[PDB]
Amino acid sequence: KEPEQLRKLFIGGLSFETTDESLRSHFEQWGTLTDCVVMRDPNTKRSRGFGFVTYATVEEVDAAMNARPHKVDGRVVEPKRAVSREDSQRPGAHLTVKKIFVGGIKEDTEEHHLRDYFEQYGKIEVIEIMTDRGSGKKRGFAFVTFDDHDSVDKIVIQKYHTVNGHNCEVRKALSKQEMASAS
DNA sequence: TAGGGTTAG
């Protein structure tokens, strides 16, 4: 049994009339669920438009993700990798992006080092090892872009990532403006 | 479209 958090998916944009029932009936197509709930307001008991589904294996959730789009109760919904309550705390951790910030890479780090490790998550579109302006000095971090936003999510949820022989930190990419709003 | 009486004795 892999971790619960890694076996659950967040389902967004659910139709107001979606119930654990319907939710379950749909996603069981890709495997055995072990949890399936529609979140709603404690008082009006009215749906909040989102819910979670959990399978018995991460392999099965991978199967479901490869199955997008997902239409439930006549409404295209949006499945995502469930982000731990704790990380949901972090600045813009729920936004949908295709680019990732990779911090703490060695000076001799080259592009192949990043491809080496990152390709296993999805089609890479761009790699950028940031250097200093006019200085040309390596800055110890980079940006990697993918075709699927899920490739990024499949990553940010893992805790460790080894690039060029050592662990490095990975976070969703935020625009210069988002950074400032965060700070 | 970010969690269910689920976070410091």
Curated annotation (Swiss-Prot):
PTM statement from Swiss-Prot or TrEMBL: Sumoylated.
A molecular-function term among this protein's GO annotations: RNA binding
Presence of the UniProt keyword RNA-binding in the record: yes
Cross-link Glycyl lysine isopeptide (Lys-Gly) (interchain with G-Cter in SUMO) mapped to chain: 106
Location relative to the cell: Nucleus; Cytoplasm
Region feature Globular B domain, mapped onto this chain: 88-178
Cross-link (Glycyl lysine isopeptide (Lys-Gly) (interchain with G-Cter in SUMO2)): 1, 71, 172, 176
GO biological process, one term: regulation of alternative mRNA splicing, via spliceosome
Coiled-coil parts of chain: none
Major localization listed first in the record, in broad terms: nucleus
Related illness: Inclusion body myopathy with early-onset Paget disease with or without frontotemporal dementia 3: An autosomal dominant disease characterized by disabling muscle weakness clinically resembling to limb girdle muscular dystrophy, osteolytic bone lesions consistent with Paget disease, and premature frontotemporal dementia. Clinical features show incomplete penetrance.
Name of the protein described by the UniProt record: Heterogeneous nuclear ribonucleoprotein A1
Source organism of the structure: Homo sapiens
Residues of the full protein shown: 8 to 190 of 372
